[PDB]
Write an enzyme that holds these catalytic residues in place. Sequence first.
Site, PDB file in Angstrom:
ATOM      1  N   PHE A 117     -87.486  23.844 -93.929  1.00 57.26           N
ATOM      2  CA  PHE A 117     -86.746  24.699 -93.024  1.00 57.26           C
ATOM      3  C   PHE A 117     -85.991  25.948 -93.633  1.00 57.26           C
ATOM      4  O   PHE A 117     -86.805  27.062 -93.678  1.00 57.26           O
ATOM      5  CB  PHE A 117     -85.629  23.976 -92.315  1.00 57.26           C
TER       6      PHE A 117
ATOM      7  N   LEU B 179     -85.795  32.416 -85.067  1.00 53.50           N
ATOM      8  CA  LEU B 179     -84.769  33.188 -85.564  1.00 53.50           C
ATOM      9  C   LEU B 179     -84.915  34.614 -85.709  1.00 53.50           C
ATOM     10  O   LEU B 179     -84.076  35.417 -85.892  1.00 53.50           O
ATOM     11  CB  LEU B 179     -84.309  32.279 -86.873  1.00 53.50           C
TER      12      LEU B 179
ATOM     13  N   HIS C  61     -81.585  37.043 -86.816  1.00 49.99           N
ATOM     14  CA  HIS C  61     -81.228  37.217 -88.348  1.00 49.99           C
ATOM     15  C   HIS C  61     -81.815  38.480 -88.745  1.00 49.99           C
ATOM     16  O   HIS C  61     -82.957  39.073 -88.184  1.00 49.99           O
ATOM     17  CB  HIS C  61     -81.732  36.171 -89.032  1.00 49.99           C
TER      18      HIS C  61
ATOM     19  N   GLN D  57     -79.951  27.229 -98.619  1.00 49.75           N
ATOM     20  CA  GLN D  57     -78.901  28.338 -99.107  1.00 49.75           C
ATOM     21  C   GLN D  57     -77.461  27.659 -99.503  1.00 49.75           C
ATOM     22  O   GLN D  57     -77.474  26.443 -99.777  1.00 49.75           O
ATOM     23  CB  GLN D  57     -78.724  29.482 -98.177  1.00 49.75           C
TER      24      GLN D  57
ATOM     25  N   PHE E 251     -79.480  32.926 -95.913  1.00 49.57           N
ATOM     26  CA  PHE E 251     -80.369  31.976 -96.083  1.00 49.57           C
ATOM     27  C   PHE E 251     -81.785  32.121 -96.514  1.00 49.57           C
ATOM     28  O   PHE E 251     -82.225  33.206 -96.218  1.00 49.57           O
ATOM     29  CB  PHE E 251     -80.219  30.821 -94.995  1.00 49.57           C
TER      30      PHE E 251
ATOM     31  N   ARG F 206     -75.851  22.665 -96.966  1.00 48.51           N
ATOM     32  CA  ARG F 206     -76.918  21.757 -96.658  1.00 48.51           C
ATOM     33  C   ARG F 206     -78.389  22.043 -96.777  1.00 48.51           C
ATOM     34  O   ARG F 206     -78.337  23.221 -97.123  1.00 48.51           O
ATOM     35  CB  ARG F 206     -76.653  21.220 -94.900  1.00 48.51           C
TER      36      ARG F 206
ATOM     37  N   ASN G 198     -75.569  34.603 -88.882  1.00 52.36           N
ATOM     38  CA  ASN G 198     -74.804  35.151 -87.721  1.00 52.36           C
ATOM     39  C   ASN G 198     -74.108  34.396 -86.721  1.00 52.36           C
ATOM     40  O   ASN G 198     -75.007  33.344 -86.725  1.00 52.36           O
ATOM     41  CB  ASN G 198     -75.167  36.425 -87.149  1.00 52.36           C
TER      42      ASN G 198
END
Lengths: 11, 165
Positions: free
Chosen positions: B60, B122, B126, B63, B113, B55, B102
């Site tokens: 935002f 995040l 991440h 990937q 991503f 997607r 994750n």
Amino acid sequence: XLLVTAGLVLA
Amino acid sequence: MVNPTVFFDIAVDGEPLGRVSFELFADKVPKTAENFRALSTGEKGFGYKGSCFHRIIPGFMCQGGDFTRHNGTGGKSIYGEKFEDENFILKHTGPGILSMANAGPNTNGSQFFICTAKTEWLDGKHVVFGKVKEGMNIVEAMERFGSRNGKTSKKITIADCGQLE
């Protein structure tokens, strides 16, 4: 929503 | 520490849009960088050479790839189907941040991503192990034709993978 995991993306 | 470089090409419906490359901080994490490196050439029974995207959300992240085994959710790593984390010395300065994905603690499959914005929620979750030196323009061009409905420019697929040994 705007999360980035690996299994069951939700809103 | 002679950091390796990796890239892969994006195809918008049987058409090469352009290449996107990434510089990894193997200097800081001479372990988890390799995971990414291997996922390009996509040996070891997985990689980004599955010609498919998950997607694309405009403004935002961007990937896709990897996994490919369990109804489009495969994914094993070169250290197993799971792998521990490293640290969070690095942070999310904003766009052009290459971060992992994750699904729990000590559970870093492989998939990553691109962060095309300040994903402050995040940060700390991440792992940041590289940045987008060049290609952000292509990523932007890609996102421009994305949507939150989980569809993008008809059907974007990974054309080919790189790995700059």
